[PDB]
Amino acid sequence: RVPAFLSAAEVEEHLRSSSLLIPPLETALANFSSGPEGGVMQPVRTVVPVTKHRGYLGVMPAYSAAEDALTTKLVTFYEDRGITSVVPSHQATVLLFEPSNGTLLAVMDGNVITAKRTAAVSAIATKFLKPPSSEVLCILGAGVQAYSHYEIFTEQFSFKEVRIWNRTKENAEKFADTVQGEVRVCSSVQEAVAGADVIITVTLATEPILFGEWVKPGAHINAVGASRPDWRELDDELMKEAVLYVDSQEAALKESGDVLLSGAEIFAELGEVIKGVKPAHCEKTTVFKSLGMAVEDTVAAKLIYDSWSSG
Amino acid sequence: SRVPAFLSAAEVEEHLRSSSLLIPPLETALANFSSGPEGGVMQPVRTVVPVTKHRGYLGVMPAYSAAEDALTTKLVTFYEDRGITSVVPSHQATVLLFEPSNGTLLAVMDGNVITAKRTAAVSAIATKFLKPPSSEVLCILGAGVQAYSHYEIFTEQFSFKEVRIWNRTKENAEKFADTVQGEVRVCSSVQEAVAGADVIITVTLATEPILFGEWVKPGAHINAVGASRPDWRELDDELMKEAVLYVDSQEAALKESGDVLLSGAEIFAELGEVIKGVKPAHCEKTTVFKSLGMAVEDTVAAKLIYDSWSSG
Ligand SMILES: NC(=O)C1=CN([C@@H]2O[C@H](COP(=O)(O)OP(=O)(O)OC[C@H]3O[C@@H](n4cnc5c(N)ncnc54)[C@@H](OP(=O)(O)O)[C@@H]3O)[C@@H](O)[C@H]2O)C=CC1
Ligand SMILES: NC(=O)C1=CN([C@@H]2O[C@H](COP(=O)(O)OP(=O)(O)OC[C@H]3O[C@@H](n4cnc5c(N)ncnc54)[C@@H](OP(=O)(O)O)[C@@H]3O)[C@H](O)[C@@H]2O)C=CC1
């Protein structure tokens, strides 16, 4: 018995659509937030800073009884060293084990899983915290997460207008050119968020790039970047003013610079909202701080492995 | 990007073969780990995911060591004992090695042999530092994977006039004595096994104390390898209370060692500290080395083998 290897291509083929991840993900998020009865054993992510290379190794193990899946995702991301750069990308790989045996069943690309699963979770949050009538969508960033998010948002919702802003203008244009559907390339984040109902922040910025003073009251913001406790994408007033929702409180309190450096108070976990124990103040300016959780990779890894296994 | 290389258990055995050769690089790693930040080792405490409905555990052990510039993560799975029903093997491990600068997963390799040898080597290091000044009788409690690896390196590293073994299941202690090279006295009770023993090795999956201080010869050195969970024990309160306690990692012991926690024993020092000389080795006193296993120990191993492998 040797572990099977699933290429990125083989994964894209058994996952195929991230909008299909929504249901199993809503379940996982709810189960994760329903404490022990939820069946998910997820310790907070551990990060190993590889300081001499300005990078980080993240390990995300999880067991979920509901679908009886035992996995662990390992990720590596290296700091932006400035605009002309040249940095190595986010890299992930997921390992799936036999829950009863402990045998390593498969090692698979985690890049597409990470792309698709993060976008799906943001979509779930948006479908819950998005305000009454919700016309304009704004995306800050133009990397892997930008595309995955755009893909599922245009599929799951209907925006009269979609905007994008990127520190490097040429990439925001490349984005608008390669994506299906029209997108307005903006030259400043304040122009991009001007009157925006839903905003998505997926950058590698360490200092605030979105200031609450530019945000339209009641807008929902998916804060996906800044997964270190000394990095920020949002301002103190945005963090101050808005009703804060996260995927995991323990994770936020350990990894979100935006939550920590601002001293904002966590209102609830997305899982709580999904199940109904916490209210969705979608009429108020909301912020969903996403850090990523092991169980989210578990449900995906599982789905894929079964699909793969079927042949 | 690169497709990760896969190293089978057999290929690991081929590129890694006398656990004795791991001793030097391991002493370095242990010293570096205990020399704080200057040591270059970034090792957060092991995280364990209990897989409750299967009575098992998933352990993740990531680490970066600048000295040898290696970035790895070992993933382990072990299931509580059940007797004959126990799953087989009880421990499964796999190590992943990454390119420290780009983050690319260079290789996924069997971790079973690494775990077996790495652990035995570390216990050997502790024993070589901690053992009484006339150490003649060796006693092993247990007869599984760790018992063999420990036996192998202890016989090669040290000179005992006598070696003893005790195992809950007598038939396996006998199978052990018959399979191993060199003579071993199979004992019918732990108390008989440790009677007058200078160095003791406990490598069982017991959750309740099996070794009581009352049977221990004053000055004996004990390598406490099992009971890696914070509600498992192998040693009793008297042994834990009267002995000078040494561990591999304080943070790890205070989080995972039931023996340390349930007894409320006070950690005297880290093995890394004594290796470097910052802490004393009270080898004339009854000592206990609580081993939990550390990621960096798998790091140095994984690296050594990956280099040998990509060479020839
Ligand atoms: N410190 C570290 O770096 C590491 C520690 N370990 C630990 O070392 C231990 C042994 O590992 P390994 O040899 O691979 O596992 P094995 O499955 O090979 O263990 C076999 C041993 O378990 C013993 N045993 C099980 N239950 C009991 C019991 N309740 N009381 C008396 N003895 C019992 C004996 O079982 P039986 O009666 O059926 O023969 C047998 O000798 C475990 O605690 C393991 O987690 C492992 C790796 C590293
Ligand atoms: N919530 C979660 O589960 C997850 C959160 N994350 C987070 O999402 C983010 C984006 O990830 P991903 O898209 O995969 O990574 P990418 O490498 O694809 O990020 C590209 C983006 O980084 C932006 N960026 C980089 N540096 C700066 C800067 N300092 N300030 C302004 N923007 C900058 C833009 O760079 P440029 O101008 O050079 O094009 C570009 O839009 C964070 O980096 C982070 O890892 C990631 C995965 C999951």
Q: Distance, in angstroms, between A210 CA and closest chain B CA?
A: 29
In chain A, residues preceding a discontinuity (C to N beyond 2.5 A) are none
Cβ neighbors of A194 (< 8 A, separation 6 or more) are A214, A216
- Token match 């775990």: residue? B115
Q: Give me the sign of the Cα torsion angle A215, A221, A227, A228.
A: positive
Give A109's strand partners. Answer: A93
Instruction: Find the CB nearest A50 among B56, B64, B91.
Output: B64
Distances (CA, A) of B183 to A1, B160, B163, B177, B223: 35, 11, 7, 7, 21
**Taking a C-beta distance cutoff of 8 angstroms, is the pair A128, A282 a contact?**
yes
**Taking a C-beta distance cutoff of 8 angstroms, is the pair A201, A141 a contact?**
yes
Alpha carbons A53 and A79: distance in angstroms, whole number: 9
Instruction: Find the CB nearest B58 among A72, A78, A107.
Output: A72
Q: Which two tokens stand for residue B265?
A: 């024993």
Alpha carbons B32 and B65: distance in angstroms, whole number: 9
Cβ neighbors of A51 (< 8 A, separation 6 or more) are B42, B64, B66
Strand order in the sheet with A161-165: A184-185, A161-165, A136-140, A198-201, A220-223, A286-289, A243-246, A268-269
Quote the ligand 2 centre to A175 CA distance (angstroms). Answer: 14
Helix axes B145-157, B112-130, angle to 10 degrees: 50
Q: Give the three-class secondary structure for B197.
A: coil
Alpha carbons B255 and B290: distance in angstroms, whole number: 12
The residue type at B86 = S
Which chain A residue is nearest to residue B4, measuring alpha carbons? A5
Helix or strand run (H / E) with residue B164? strand B162-166
Ligand 2: list residues with CB < 6 Å: A 77, 80, 89-90, 114, 118, 141-146, 166-168, 171, 202-205, 209, 224-225, 227, 290-292
Residue B272: closest CA among B291, B248, B296:
B248
Quote the ligand 2 centre to A141 CA distance (angstroms). Answer: 7
Residue A73: closest CA among A39, A32, A115:
A115
DSSP-derived secondary structure for chain A: ---EEE-HHHHHHHH--STTTHHHHHHHHHHHHSGGGG-EE-PPPEEEEEGGGTEEEEEEEEEETTTTEEEEEEEEEE----TT---PPPEEEEEEE-TTT--EEEEEE-HHHHHHHHHHHHHHHHHHH--SS--EEEEE--SHHHHHHHHHHHHH---SEEEEE-SSHHHHHHHHHHSSS--EE-SSHHHHHTT-SEEEE----SS--B-GGGSPTT-EEEE----STT--SB-HHHHHHSEEEES-HHHHHHH-HHHHTTTPPP-EEHHHHHHTSS---TTS-EEEE----HHHHHHHHHHHHHHHHT-
Closest-CA residue, ligand 1 atom 3, reads B293
Alpha carbons B69 and A52: distance in angstroms, whole number: 9
In short, whether B41's Cβ falls inside 6 Å of ligand 1 is no
E strands present in B45-86:
47-51, 56-65, 70-79
Q: Domains along chain B?
A: 1-131+294-312 (3.30.1780.10), 132-293 (3.40.50.720)
Cβ neighbors of B159 (< 8 A, separation 6 or more) are none
Number of C-beta neighbours around residue B177 at 10 A: 18
Alpha carbons B134 and B127: distance in angstroms, whole number: 12
How many angstroms from the chain centroid is the CA of residue A86? Answer: 24
DSSP single-letter state for residue B46: P
Q: What is the interface size between A and B, counted as CB pairs within 8 Å?
A: 129
Q: Is B81 exposed, middle or buried (0-12, 13-18, 19+ CB in 10 A)?
A: middle
**Taking a C-beta distance cutoff of 8 angstroms, is the pair B193, B219 a contact?**
no
Contact A78 B103 (CB under 8 A): yes
Cβ neighbors of B178 (< 8 A, separation 6 or more) are none
Ligand-binding site membership of B46 (annotated): yes
Q: Which residues of A touch B71 (CB under 8 A)?
A: 48, 50, 57
Burial track B105-143 (b if 16+ CB lie within 10 A, e otherwise): bbbbbbbbbbbbbbbbbbbbbbbbbbbbeebebbbbbbb
Alpha carbons A175 and A171: distance in angstroms, whole number: 6
Expressed in Å, this structure's resolution amounts to 2.6
- Token match 């780990």: residue? B33
Closest-CA residue, ligand 2 atom 7, reads A225
Quote the ligand 2 centre to B71 CA distance (angstroms). Answer: 23
**HEC readout, A89-151:** CCEEEEEEECCCCCCEEEEEECHHHHHHHHHHHHHHHHHHHCCCCCCEEEEECCCHHHHHHHH
Quote the ligand 2 centre to A90 CA distance (angstroms). Answer: 9
Residue A234: closest CA among A266, A199, A268, A267:
A199
Instruction: Find the CB nearest B104 among A70, A91, A102.
Output: A91
Residue B229: closest CA among B50, B32, B64:
B50
Instruction: Find the CB nearest A46 among B6, B62, B91.
Output: B62
Which ligand 1 atom is at minimum distance from the Cα of B88? 17
Alpha carbons A68 and A38: distance in angstroms, whole number: 12
Contact A102 B94 (CB under 8 A): no
In short, whether B193's Cβ falls inside 6 Å of ligand 1 is no
Q: Is A118 left (phi over 0), alpha (psi -120 to 50) or beta?
A: alpha
Instruction: Determine contact: B252 vs chain A, CB below 8 A.
Output: no
Residue A12: closest CA among A124, A139, A151, A143:
A151
Helix or strand run (H / E) with residue B275? helix B271-276
**Taking a C-beta distance cutoff of 8 angstroms, is the pair A223, A288 a contact?**
yes
Instruction: Determine contact: B9 vs chain A, CB below 8 A.
Output: no
The structure's method of determination equals X-ray
Phi and psi dihedrals of A225, rounded to 5?
-85, -170
Burial track A24-48 (b if 16+ CB lie within 10 A, e otherwise): bbbbbbbbbbbeeebbbbbbbbbbb
Q: Which two tokens stand for residue B23?
A: 């001793």
Quote the ligand 1 centre to A271 CA distance (angstroms). Answer: 39
Q: Which residues of B touch A76 (CB under 8 A)?
A: 98, 103
- Token match 């245009």: residue? A154
Alpha carbons B310 and B312: distance in angstroms, whole number: 6
